[PDB]
Amino acid sequence: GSEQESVKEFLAKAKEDFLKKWENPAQNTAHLDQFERIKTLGTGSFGRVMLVKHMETGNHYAMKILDKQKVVKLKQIEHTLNEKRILQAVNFPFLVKLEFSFKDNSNLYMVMEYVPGGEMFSHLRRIGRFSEPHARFYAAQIVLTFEYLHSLDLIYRDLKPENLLIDQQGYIQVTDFGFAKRVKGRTWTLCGTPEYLAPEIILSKGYNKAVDWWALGVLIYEMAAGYPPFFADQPIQIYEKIVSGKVRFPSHFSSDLKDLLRNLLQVDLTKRFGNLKNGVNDIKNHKWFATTDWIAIYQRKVEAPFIPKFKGPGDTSNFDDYEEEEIRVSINEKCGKEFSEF
Amino acid sequence: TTYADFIASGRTGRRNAI
Ligand SMILES: c1nc(N2CCC3(CCCCN3)CC2)c2nc[nH]c2n1
Predict the structure, then answer these.
(1) Which positions does the site annotation Important for inhibition cover (chain B)?
(2) Burial class (CB within 10 angstroms; exposed 0-12, middle 13-18, buried 19+) of A130
(3) Does A167 qualify as catalytic in the annotation?
């Protein structure tokens, strides 16, 4: 029949599920003492992401720790509340699942599914670049994820290989919703990663979901070339390159890839793919995606081009090593009012 | 080459958000 009507039906039901959780968020579903801390998997501005073991079940999880005082100093209160409120309400095959959340006197905690394959960033840098079919397999998953998120009035705002984990089946799990926002109109916050910013963000204009479509163009280029389309030693030089209106493609890029990338890395919003009358369909029906079976991808039926090595449960060999700082919980509650809804 | 220019740049490591 029409795949678009099945898509509409699917999205309508997903919105109903989302709104119930969006309106009544899960809160205080575990405690720190229920987890044994094993190893730091990564760090952020507010703290570490640690591999943990849930003692009652023996399950491994990734626990994100955010120091409330550091969130406040960085003026990230609202963004932190958006992050947990959004992540607890979403549900899609390529979005990392939030299993528990809670807080104590010092910190906020988000306990998520542990994705052991490591960041796409690690594999991309080591290998050098991904072949076109390899990059297309990952790109298809972001296209579907964005179609889902945007239907919920969500903007993701931080697409990059660092934020994409590879699961045991070789599929993507998107993490890091620190800048995600539920917004119907236009928004103005200067946020994201320099190499991935759309021109409208750099130029301090009101922007919308089209910034995630521009960031998809940067991701595809990076995966297929091994380097971003706009790079320099400092962010200001990156911004000058982004606003210039010029992109150079490697000679090995197929004609179809370049065409898709010119329509994604498009300064003109009345011309950027994902932003027109046909919406996501301009991307899904592009020639570069002709061999992509969208349903088979969503159903996880497609054989992945790369399966990460798995030594066993709790193995962290696909992640870099980090300095370990022991968690401290103050005897006094910090920033209680600011994080009341968490 | 552009690859050599990228590899010699200070931005091949993990990138932080603004
Ligand atoms: C494994 N590792 C995770 N980490 C958090 C995100 C990370 C660290 C911070 C920058 C982006 N990448 C990598 C480790 C997970 N976050 C959720 N599930 C996870 N499984």
Answers:
(1) 11, 14-15
(2) buried
(3) no
- Concatenated DSSP letters for A151-173? HTTEE----SGGGEEE-TTS-EE
SS3 A110: strand
Where do the H-state alpha helices sit in A76-131? 77-89, 120-127
**What distance in Å separates the CA atoms of residue A18 and residue A76, rounded to the nearest whole number?**
24
Token look-up 């590899």 returns B7
Closest residue in chain A to residue B7, using alpha carbons only:
A227
Instruction: Give the helix ranges, DSSP H, for A273-315.
Output: 281-284, 294-298
Question: Where does residue A227 rank: exposed (0-12), middle (13-18), buried (19+ CB within 10 A)?
Answer: buried
Q: Which residues contact A59 (CB under 8 A, 6 or more apart)?
A: A53
C-beta separation of A38 from A314 below 8 A:
yes
Domains and CATH numbers, chain A: 7-24+119-309 (1.10.510.10), 25-118+310-340 (3.30.200.20)
Please choose, from the candidates A168, A147, A140, A148, the residue with its C-alpha nearest in 3D space to the C-alpha of residue A290.
Answer: A140
Residue matched to tokens 């955010």 = A66
Asked if A112 contacts A207 with a C-beta cutoff of 8 angstroms, the reply is no
CB contact at 8 A, A301 and A140: no
Question: Would the CB of A212 count as within 6 Å of ligand 1?
Answer: no
| Vertex A133: Cα angle to A14 and A10 (nearest 5) | 10
CA A196 centroid distance within chain: 12
Q: What is the resolution of this structure in A?
A: 2.0
Determine the Cα angle at A120 with ends A115 and A126, to 5°. Answer: 125
How far is ligand 1, taken at its centre, from the CA of residue A42, in Å? 6
Query: What is the DSSP code (8-state) at residue A226?
Result: S
Asked whether A103 and A338 are in contact (CB, 8 A), the reply is no
Are the CB atoms for A324 and A141 separated by under 8 Å?
Answer: no
Q: Is the CB of A44 under 6 A from ligand 1?
A: yes
Token pair for residue A48?
Answer: 């570490």
Residue whose entry in the numeric block shows the structure tokens 């005082």? A69
